[PDB]
Structure formats: C-alpha cells, structure tokens
Amino acid sequence: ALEEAPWPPPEGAFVGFVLSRKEPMWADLLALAAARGGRVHRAPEPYKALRDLKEARGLLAKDLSVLALREGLGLPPGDDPMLLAYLLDPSNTTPEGVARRYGGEWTEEAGERAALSERLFANLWGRLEGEERLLWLYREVERPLSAVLAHMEATGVRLDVAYLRALSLEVAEEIARLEAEVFRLAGHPFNLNSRDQLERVLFDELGLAAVLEALREAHPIVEKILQYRELTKLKSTYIDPLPDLIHPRTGRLHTRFNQTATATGRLSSSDPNLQNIPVRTPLGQRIRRAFIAEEGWLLVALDYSQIELRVLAHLSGDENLIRVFQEGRDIHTETASWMFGVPREAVDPLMRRAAKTINFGVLYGMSAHRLSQELAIPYEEAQAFIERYFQSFPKVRAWIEKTLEEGRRRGYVETLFGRRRYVPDLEARVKSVREAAERMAFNMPVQGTAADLMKLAMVKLFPRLEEMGARMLLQVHDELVLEAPKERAEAVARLAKEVMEGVYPLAVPLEVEVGIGEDWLSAKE
Template structure:
C-alpha cells in the first residue's frame, strides 16, 4: 500500500497526539532495584579484584590512559586499533583481545554491568513521579532517521532482553494489583518485510509454511537437514539473516562469529544463492537511490542520502547500507505506529480500562485488568497482524505476566 504522504504524516503524528496523550506511565518496584544494585556492586567488586590480579597491579578501570598502559605496555597485548591519542581500548578492541588474554573478557563484563547499573538500576528509582508512583518515559517521533520511536527521560528501549541482568531489570516493571502486563511482539518483522519487498520466492514460501527461517538458512549454508541444525549453526544463520538487512559484509560477519573472512564470504554467497531475490533487490535499491538521492519506506516516507554518490568510498558504502536498511526498518516503524493508532482507537471505542504503557521497537506493552485479559490478547494480535497486508503473514507473539520479564520471556 502507498498512502498519500500528507495522509500518512497526519496518521503517524496521531501516535503522539492520541496514543501517548496523558501518558499513563508504568509501575516500578524500587525495592527490587535497590536489592539488585547491591548484588551488582558485589559482582563489580569481584570483577575488579580479578582484573587487578590479571594485570599484576591496581589501576583506574575507567581511565583509558591507565588501561592502555596495562594492556599494551605491561601485558604486551597486540594493538588492534589506533586513535589520535593512542591505542584504542573500546568494546570492539576488547572483543578481539578476548582470545589473547582473559583480562579482556573480564573488562567487557565489568563495563557491561557498570553501564546497566549506572543507566538503569541507580537511575530508575530516582525517576519515579512522586504524584503517580510511576515512571513516565518520553517518546520522540522525529529523532531516529529510520522513523522508529525513541525513548528518553529515561530511555527504556535499550534494556537488554537476552542477558540475565537485563531480565532482572525488567522484573522491576510491574503491574498493579488486579492487573497484568501484556506484551505483544512482532515476530521477525524486518525479515518478513524483506521477503515482501524483495519478492524472493524461497523467502516468501518459508514464511508461508511457518518455517524457522534461521534454521532453514543454516541447513542450506551447512548442507544438512533442518533437523540436524545445531544451536551454533542457527546462531550463525541468524547473524547472516539480520546482517544482510543492515548491509553487513564478510569482515564484520567474520568478527561477529569468530570465523575466517573467507568462510564468512562463503556463507554470505550461499545466502544469496538461497535467496537470489534479495541480492537483486539490494542492487535495485542502490541504483534507485543513486538516481533519486533518497530511499522510501513501503508507505512512501523518504530518507535523503546525500553521500550515495560520494567519491569517498567509505561514505558511499555507508550510504548504500542505509539505502537497503531504511526501507525495511522504516517500514517496520510505520507498521507498528499504524497498529498503535488502530489499537488505541479500538480500546477507546470499547471503553476498555486497559492502557498502552510501553513501546519498545517491535513490542507493545499494555497494563490490563485481569477481566480484560482475554479480549486484549485477541485485540492486540488482530490489530497488529492486520495493520498492513504483506505477501507473507505478520505474526505477533502475545504473552502476559505480573512483570515485564514474565510477559516477554
């Protein structure tokens, strides 16, 4: 579907005017966060001692200058990347050094815990509104270039889903008595949009049959039956499936999977053999972007790409990655916003007491009275899966729980 740009702009603005007018906020268990903070302090202390022991001396873990001296002068580790001030000690460098010395792995763990503690565990209790006893984040319509909503004061969209500590933080988001939190999450929406936009027959058929797309890709890459695909094989295929969306090349895939660049190239080539329509679409998108100077989402929203014809190879390559990602991620953003509008309108029409309290990328979270739970499950699935008609089915996973962690297992 291609909506009139003015009509689409008006509908998208309604997300802010309707869905978030008089934001309800979300309940927080501050006691849990305080206990979690004490636990993380203990973990940080343990990691700090282990790092000092591996380094052979104590130093300021937050000082790049002192860390640089420990890693490259004292321990003699190889310099991976340089900056204007000397060898880099950023995350990508530590990830590469992890195979050479255990101190790098400990430093990565320390930084991850420290960041989550300072960003969420310590901050969230202070941001509870004393009048409501809830946290009221701010959703921004026009911050991200792809059109996705962003969240600030506090940012609730970057809490890790898969890490143990991320799940513990999500346990602090709670429903009030007599209510449940209901999570409705689009399943692999970007890959489904990719199938629709590219028209690739193999990709479309896989989604129509309800296949595990990552397992199917892994089976083809490794030349095994789907039932023989291991968890490691599936993880690698998942990295490829999503990496293609973001324009990932052999170098970055090799780094992510810890494999040789030659093997990463073979995997990517096999992917394009399996889904030839994807490669053809990427080439068409790049060509059209060079001609127009912009790309569009499925609904006609444009993103300008001034560097798409740049003589600077790095700038041009980055613009090409954006050109193939924006129609996918931008369309996903448009779809969930349209679903939010339809859901909000239907909830008002029915006079429901359920409220939409969080939006996190492809997920909507509702605070639902127990008496409305069955209805809201059906309503969320119906409106989200029916927000737009694609060549493949949209699928929404719906679950509920006392906490956000329970609702999004």
C-alpha cells in the same frame, strides 16, 4: 510586529508555550500564547488559560498535551509543523533546525513561538499537499499518533523500588568481586577508574578507548575489566537513577517518547531510554523485572516475530522466502537447508547457526568481513556462503540492486508506505561515505516499513483499547507493552493480537508473540 489582543483567541489559533524544564511531566508552564490572523493573544495566567483551548495546535503540541493531561485536562495535540517537516525530510529533527532551514528563528518567547508555528504550518503544508502518499501518512498515522504518545507519556509505568534497591546491592557486589579478581591478576590494588594508574598497570607487563581495550583481549584481566566497565555503566545508567525518576503526583515513571528523532521513522525514548537496555542478557532481563503492573492489573506484552525478514520477503517478492513464512516453517532451518542443499531432516545445528548469522548479517548492513571472525571460518568460504545465500534467494539480490539504482536516479529511497529519506551520498567517491549510504539505502525501506506498521498498529489499536479499561504503556524495538485489569487481560490480549497481525495486508503473514504477567519479565513468556 503583530497586534496584541486579549485572551482567549478564536478556535483554530496556533499555540506557543514555554516550559521551565524539558520534561513536560516535571516542568512548570511559564508562558502561553496564541496566534491567528495577524494577532497575538498572551494568557494572563497560563494554567487556567489552557481550559479555553479545545486543541493544542502548533510546534511540539504533544508536549503541551502531556502537561495538560497531568492537570486533568483533555487537551488533544493537533497539527504540528514538526511532523510535516519530518515527513518532507527525516533530517528535520529539532525545532531550531527546522526554523533555520525554513526562514524562522526559534526563541524562548511564547508569543513568537505561537507566530512561528502558524507561519511554518502554512509554508510546509503547501509543500506537502502535492505529495499524495505523505499526506496520507500525516493524516492516517502521524497526527493521530501524537495523541497516543501523549497518553502513554502521561500515564507512565509503575516500578518496584524495593526490587530496584536490592538489585543495586547485588550488582555492587559482583563489581567488588570482579575488582578483587583484577587485583589478583595485577598483583597489587589500584584505581581502575584512573587513566594513569590503569595505563601503567597495562604497560607494566603487557605490550600495547574501549575499542583499544576490546582489541587487547590477550590477558584475562582485560576481559574482566571491560565487564567491570559494563556493569558500572548499567548500574549508574539504569539501576540507580530509576527510583529518583518516579513522579510524586503519580507514583509512576514517565519515560519520554519522540516522534521525529530517528533517521528511519522508528520511535525513540528518553529518561530512561528503553532502546539501550540489554536485550537477552541476564542483567538486562533483571532490569525489565522492575517494571510492574498496578495492584489488580496485569501487563500484556506483544512482540513482532522477525518482522524485518517478513518485510524483506514482501519487498523483494522472493518466492522462496515468502513460502517459508506462508508455510510457517522455521526460517533459519530452511535457510540452512537451502544453502547446503540438504533436506530439513538433516540440518546440523552448526548449519542452523551459520544461517541464523547470515540472515541477521544481511539485514543490518552487509556483514561481509564480520562473517569470518564471528564464524571462525576461512575468508574464501565466507564469501561462498554469502553467494550460496543469494543463490537461494535471487530476488533479494535483485531487490538490493534495484533499490540502489532507484536511489542513484531519484535521489531518495522510500518505505512501503511512501516515507522517504534522501541519500545524496550514493554518488560519493569516498569509500566509507558511499558504503555508509549504501547500508542506509536498503536499511531504510526494511526498518522504515517495520516502524510504519507498528505505528499504524498503535493508532488503530488505541481507540478500541480505551473502549475497555486498558492502557498503552511502552513501545521499544518491535514490542508493545499494555496494562489491563486482571479479569480483562486475556480478552485484551486476544484483541491486540488480531489488530496488530491484520494491520496491513502482506504477502507474508504477520505473527505476534503475546505474554501476560505481573511484571515485564514474567509477561515475556
């Protein structure tokens, strides 16, 4: 046991806390404690207790910072063992998981959480001090980012409830129509949500899991059904819930951001989860339209153009790919031109399509077999096309090979900045497993770097942003969403563009599309 001591603790103490709910902005602070030396300090009354701390230092610091901010206190997030653990091995994503792996237990008791933080920090910090690159990431990117996220989560984003309500009825209507059609193609009404009734109808005149249904695209009814499922999912996952997630004390929505969740270092969101809102789908766009600016403010949305290809270009050092970007020429057009040995002027739109497909196909995994189906071209030609590609960008092939070799030898792969991911499976004899590792192997450096760049961008942008009355609100994919006063907008945009594009010196220029509007959808123009 440790020695009890009265509140407050000397500065530099590690904080432990317990919430009544997982969402910081909605939870009630039940317990608060601090540890330093061999002592523990338990706060008599949690809320007031916060004011005695100059820095939330410990496990899940950001979360506490959020609660404090909603209470009008500027309590900054400090060192957090989670970040260190994550940097050591991206597998470390939850506090319970980390504790177990490193000798501690995660309990629902403030004091204990306070002690655990101290212990962990010392332990992991030692292990990190020898890693030049990782220490850099922790200090220059990770830690500072905590503050940023804290503010984002706390400020939140305004929603157009009126619009949401309306949209709900529209989709409900489309659903009814689809349902009607299904009945027509079935000859008799029935419950689409009922397994038994569905199965019978299918077997009724057809010869037979969403995958199963997808494969059974033989009768139009199956198509229409899947559409029904889709709309239903979206309506209940994004349209209907949103209004209910508006915090009473702010009038805005507070989506959660996690810093140590994805396997590649990309930020993830929850409640909702922007990541899964349909990209360029009529409905998806309509949902984005719900996110609006404050009365007298505007939304500035910045997006990175094909960052992954530019990153690849840099990591491979492929003269051709590099030239495409340095020359500012259309990537897909040039790809086609190369693959088919035809000058720009004669690029058939179908060639462009093929190129576009391959380009993306080589990024996410190595879309080999998929090519046939997605292109409706015979097997042989598909392989040839792939060959033509690497023939045009040799160094990309060389890079992929090198990456895997290094992976097998060292046991891990790393992003441009040094972030690492261990890949033991590259030596697996089981096909599917080894192939999975292989995808991950080259996906990691490309995606990881894209993530790192964005994070670096944010970190160094925040201070300057705050200098003007501007706010950082959302981050999804390779996109940032800001909020700024009507008269300041244009200026803020100009700044954001520069900062982002010049975040780090690449052999390829970085480009950012910028849009300003009253709502997210309008902004993206």
